Amino acid sequence: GKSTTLFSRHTKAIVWGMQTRAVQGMLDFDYVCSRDEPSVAAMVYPFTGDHKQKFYWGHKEILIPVFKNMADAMRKHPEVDVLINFASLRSAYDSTMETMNYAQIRTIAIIAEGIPEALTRKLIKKADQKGVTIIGPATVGGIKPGCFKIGNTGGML
Amino acid sequence: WARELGLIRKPASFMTSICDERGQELIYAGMPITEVFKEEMGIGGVLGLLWFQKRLPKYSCQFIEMCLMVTADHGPAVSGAHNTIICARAGKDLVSSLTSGLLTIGDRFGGALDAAAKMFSKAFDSGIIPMEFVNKMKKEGKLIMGIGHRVKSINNPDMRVQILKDYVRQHFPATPLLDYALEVEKITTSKKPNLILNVDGLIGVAFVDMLRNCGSFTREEADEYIDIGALNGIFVLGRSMGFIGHYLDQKRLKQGLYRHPWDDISYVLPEHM
Amino acid sequence: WARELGLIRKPASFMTSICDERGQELIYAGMPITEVFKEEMGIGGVLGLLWFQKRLPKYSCQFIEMCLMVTADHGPAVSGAHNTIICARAGKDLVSSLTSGLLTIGDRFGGALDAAAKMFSKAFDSGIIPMEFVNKMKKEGKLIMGIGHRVKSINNPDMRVQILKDYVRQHFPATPLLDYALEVEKITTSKKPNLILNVDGLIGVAFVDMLRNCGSFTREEADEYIDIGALNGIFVLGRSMGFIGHYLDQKRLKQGLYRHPWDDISYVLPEHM
Amino acid sequence: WARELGLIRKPASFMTSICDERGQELIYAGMPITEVFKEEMGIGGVLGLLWFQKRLPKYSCQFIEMCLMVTADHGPAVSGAHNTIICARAGKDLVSSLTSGLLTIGDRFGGALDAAAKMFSKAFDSGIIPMEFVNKMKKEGKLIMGIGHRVKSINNPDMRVQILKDYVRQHFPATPLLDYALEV
Numbered sequence: 001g002k003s004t005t006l007f008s009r010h011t012k013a014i015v016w017g018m019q020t021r022a023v024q025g026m027l028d029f030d031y032v033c034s035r036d037e038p039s040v041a042a043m044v045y046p047f048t049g050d051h052k053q054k055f056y057w058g059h060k061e062i063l064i065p066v067f068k069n070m071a072d073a074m075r076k077h078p079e080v081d082v083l084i085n086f087a088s089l090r091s092a093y094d095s096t097m098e099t100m101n102y103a104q105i106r107t108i109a110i111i112a113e114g115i116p117e118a119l120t121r122k123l124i125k126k127a128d129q130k131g132v133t134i135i136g137p138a139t140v141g142g143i144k145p146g147c148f149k150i151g152n153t154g155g156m157l
Numbered sequence: 158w159a160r161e162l163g164l165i166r167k168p169a170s171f172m173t174s175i176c177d178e179r180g181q182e183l184i185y186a187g188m189p190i191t192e193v194f195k196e197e198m199g200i201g202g203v204l205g206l207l208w209f210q211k212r213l214p215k216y217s218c219q220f221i222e223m224c225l226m227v228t229a230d231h232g233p234a235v236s237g238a239h240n241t242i243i244c245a246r247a248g249k250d251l252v253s254s255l256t257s258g259l260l261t262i263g264d265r266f267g268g269a270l271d272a273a274a275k276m277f278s279k280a281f282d283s284g285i286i287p288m289e290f291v292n293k294m295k296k297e298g299k300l301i302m303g304i305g306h307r308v309k310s311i312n313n314p315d316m317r318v319q320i321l322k323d324y325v326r327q328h329f330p331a332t333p334l335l336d337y338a339l340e341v342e343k344i345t346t347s348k349k350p351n352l353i354l355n356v357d358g359l360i361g362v363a364f365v366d367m368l369r370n371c372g373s374f375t376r377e378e379a380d381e382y383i384d385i386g387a388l389n390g391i392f393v394l395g396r397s398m399g400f401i402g403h404y405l406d407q408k409r410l411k412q413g414l415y416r417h418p419w420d421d422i423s424y425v426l427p428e429h430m
Numbered sequence: 431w432a433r434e435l436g437l438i439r440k441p442a443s444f445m446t447s448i449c450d451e452r453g454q455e456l457i458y459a460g461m462p463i464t465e466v467f468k469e470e471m472g473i474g475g476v477l478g479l480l481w482f483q484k485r486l487p488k489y490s491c492q493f494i495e496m497c498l499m500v501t502a503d504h505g506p507a508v509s510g511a512h513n514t515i516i517c518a519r520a521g522k523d524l525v526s527s528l529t530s531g532l533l534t535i536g537d538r539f540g541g542a543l544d545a546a547a548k549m550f551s552k553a554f555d556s557g558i559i560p561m562e563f564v565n566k567m568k569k570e571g572k573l574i575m576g577i578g579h580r581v582k583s584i585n586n587p588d589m590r591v592q593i594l595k596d597y598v599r600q601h602f603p604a605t606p607l608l609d610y611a612l613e614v615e616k617i618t619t620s621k622k623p624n625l626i627l628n629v630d631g632l633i634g635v636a637f638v639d640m641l642r643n644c645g646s647f648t649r650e651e652a653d654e655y656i657d658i659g660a661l662n663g664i665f666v667l668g669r670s671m672g673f674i675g676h677y678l679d680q681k682r683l684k685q686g687l688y689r690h691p692w693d694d695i696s697y698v699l700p701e702h703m
Numbered sequence: 704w705a706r707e708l709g710l711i712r713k714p715a716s717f718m719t720s721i722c723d724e725r726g727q728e729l730i731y732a733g734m735p736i737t738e739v740f741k742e743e744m745g746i747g748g749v750l751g752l753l754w755f756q757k758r759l760p761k762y763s764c765q766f767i768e769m770c771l772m773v774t775a776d777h778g779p780a781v782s783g784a785h786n787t788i789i790c791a792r793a794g795k796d797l798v799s800s801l802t803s804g805l806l807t808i809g810d811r812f813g814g815a816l817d818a819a820a821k822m823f824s825k826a827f828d829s830g831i832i833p834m835e836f837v838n839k840m841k842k843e844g845k846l847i848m849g850i851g852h853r854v855k856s857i858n859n860p861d862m863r864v865q866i867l868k869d870y871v872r873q874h875f876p877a878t879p880l881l882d883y884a885l886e887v
């Protein structure tokens with residue numbers, strides 16, 4: 001069941017990895033589009049503990065929680081339907097398989113170019129089996145003006 | 158000038174929540190210093206506002222002051238006070254002498270507070286009865302820390318364990334962990350009569366009991382300040398009083414620089430390298 | 431065994447007079463710990479027993495607690511709290527973080543207490559009127575330390591200078607040195623409106639006033655503890671509360687290791703050596 | 704007087720083996736200070752005598768001096784040098800400023816030396832190949848410490864890693880653990 005609405009003004013996302021420049025550009029795009037809520041709910045990084053990262057919401061300082069595992073980030077944020085995987089070319093496949101075990105995710109954008117084609121075919125097969133839309137790999141992302149931006153598409157403001 | 162007009166953003170580091178030096182008057186947690194003095198809270202009140210950011214009740218602040226005054230000094234032959242007297246006797250100032258005494262406070266000297274608190278907290282939270290807990294500590298090959306005094310055993314109580322224990326009995330609302338530690342010492346005094354709760358163990362278990370038994374703590378924060386080491390801050394802040402007193406005493410008696418005797422060394426150097 | 435029978439003498443060093451760890455119970459000056467708790471003396475009472483070896487009166491002990499709580503913290507942007515936050519943020523324990531913050535306390539940071547106390551004591555003991563004293567300080571080329579605030583000037587008082595000043599006015603028996611410092615600030619506010627007594631100056635002059643105005647001090651001991659540095663112990667013991675709070679706050683917010691920006695250095699290295 | 708005649712025993716604590724201040728001249732391990740200066744050993748020689756109580760060979764002492772000089776400073780923006788500059792700028796003496804800077808050295812600042820040494824020692828002593836070791840560190844969720852630089856990557860070497868590495872290659876007799884770390 002691939003939905004025809006991927007992103008809206010209620011769309012939240014989980015960014016996989018230390019990409020605070022991309023998350024800051026995400027929050028800048030959300031602020032300039034007169035959106036009430038930030039679209040980054042949590043950040044997942046297995047190489048550090050659970051803490052908070054200090055970002056900008058326009059003029060204001062806000063805190064985005066960075067989680068070690070994916071399960072606590074999925075439990076604490078049930079409104080997330082988008083995961084943006086900023087993992088490398090060798091750690092994107094297992095992270096995407098771990099993402100697709102959660103039914104709340106409706107789309108995954110895989111940013112990393114490089115992945116072998118057989119693992120990408122396995123990702124495509126499980127995406128057709130689960131209905132999750134995979135934007136990528138080897139992409140910069142996708143932009144919906146007024147609603148949501150993926151990663152580094154467009155650039156800065 | 159360009160931040161006055163608000164056309165730039167600089168990422169501001171150094172996040173803090175314990176003091177507001179700017180503005181009109183000093184704000185510790187969310188309340189001004191004049192409201193601190195008007196409500197007549199003690200030094201335990203400003204430890205509540207500065208360390209925990211919460212207005213602790215009057216019995217909790219008075220107990221924090223009470224556990225500070227018993228921790229104040231325990232003689233000069235302890236290791237940190239020895240460091241304080243040595244550094245003060247070598248012509249140093251108050252900061253260096255107190256500092257060199259405070260740096261001795263670690264796991265062996267003054268470490269019974271936080272480790273005894275964590276030991277009894279892990280015993281009580283895991284649902285183990287004291288009879289099984291004592292056997293588990295015995296057969297793991299490590300002693301129950303916070304329990305065991307050298308000389309004062311049975312109908313000869315520590316007399317500052319007694320005052321703190323009495324204040325916790327009439328003034329605290331509910332004491333599960335203190336009663337657990339009382340059962341553990343009732344077992345270990347049946348083993349050997351001088352295995353009573355130390356002041357280092359009773360302050361620890363009553364401090365965990367205070368954090369998880371009184372109001373305003375949400376049962377992860379009461380277990381978080383133990384892990385961070387708020388028990389160590391109580392010991393170091395209490396013993397700083399006695400260390401500054403040791404500095405003032407060794408400077409007032411006007412004693413010259415100490416050198417250890419050579420008959421108390423017993424050099425074991427190798428023959429030739 | 432040969433000292434039990436008393437047939438040898440060993441010269442005993444390490445003279446002390448602030449604690450008696452042996453015997454039955456803890457004795458601070460000459461009184462046991464149960465008499466400390468039964469007489470209901472505060473933390474200022476055990477600073478009186480440990481630092482000065484004297485039972486200070488109730489207003490003096492309450493004033494010592496009062497001057498401890500205003501000294502507790504003054505924000506993170508001060509230099510010692512910056513050292514505490516830096517050392518705590520680099521993964522160190524409480525002792526190292528508090529210690530590295532306390533070692534900043536010297537002549538520039540926190541040195542206004544003891545030096546302001548000595549300055550006003552040498553002004554008052556030498557029989558110089560405040561009008562001549564201000565001119566003497568002006569024409570010697572150094573500022574009156576303990577006097578001068580950045581923002582809060584006239585009908586906008588420091589609001590913790592006010593509480594301490596009020597408590598000294600109703601509760602102290604006689605205040606010569608405080609009135610002398612009031613005349614000095616009445617001159618210097620006629621010069622520039624923000625030249626009021628700081629808390630660092632008022633605690634100093636009121637502490638000297640307390641030692642030389644209340645009982646049990648014999649007028650060389652009241653001038654001796656100022657020279658030794660008992661004012662510095664008040665500041666360091668007070669600010670240790672805020673420094674331990676800073677350690678617990680920077681460990682609870684879970685902030686990673688700090689590195690200074692390279693645009694806030696301005697390297698001026700030579701061209702080639 | 705009663706210990707001069709030897710009719711009493713006092714239990715002597717404070718056991719030490721790194722210096723002999725008594726007697727004629729200073730003895731570090733078992734050798735006098737004049738033999739230290741006559742054999743022309745460097746500062747690495749007295750770290751060998753004082754820390755390890757052994758006369759290290761000349762390449763080992765020169766390598767100890769070499770690893771001291773690259774460790775000497777890495778700018779003021781590091782956390783300990785920031786503490787040193789803050790404490791020195793507040794009117795303190797050398798001991799307090801150096802001390803407040805040294806107390807920053809812990810697990811996060813300067814902890815990569817001992818923890819990286821223990822990590823590669825536990826990797827090499829347990830018989831794990833580097834290809835399995837990197838995957839084991841990746842799937843345990845913690846980074847290989849001692850590995851990873853911010854800017855200087857490939858054909859742009861650290862230029863003090865290179866000098867130490869070259870000195871270890873020509874002067875050390877056998878390098879199993881260095882070759883293991885090179886494979887990692």
Ligand SMILES: CC(=O)SCCNC(=O)CCNC(=O)[C@H](O)C(C)(C)COP(=O)(O)OP(=O)(O)OC[C@H]1O[C@@H](n2cnc3c(N)ncnc32)[C@H](O)[C@@H]1OP(=O)(O)O
Binds near residue numbers: 087112847
């Ligand atoms: C014109 C245009 O611009 S169009 C752009 C369109 N094309 C693209 O988007 C493709 C570009 N690709 C990318 O940008 C990258 O692939 C990105 C975004 C995923 C970034 O990935 P990278 O930064 O390479 O990987 P990452 O930072 O996770 O680190 C790589 C490895 O280093 C490992 N690592 C990091 N630190 C350490 C350490 N100290 N010790 C050991 N290993 C370490 C990481 O764990 C990771 O391991 P893994 O690869 O097994 O996970």
Ligand SMILES: O=C([O-])CC(=O)C(=O)O
Binds near residue numbers: 231357
């Ligand atoms: O606190 C400690 O563990 C050591 C101490 O003061 C004592 O001798 O009782």
Ligand SMILES: O=C([O-])CC(=O)C(=O)O
Binds near residue numbers: 504508539541542543
């Ligand atoms: O006493 C000092 O000089 C430091 C201080 O707290 C302040 O800035 O007021």
Ligand SMILES: O=C([O-])CC(=O)C(=O)O
Binds near residue numbers: 777781813814815
């Ligand atoms: O030794 C450390 O871990 C920190 C350091 O000097 C660096 O910035 O390289």
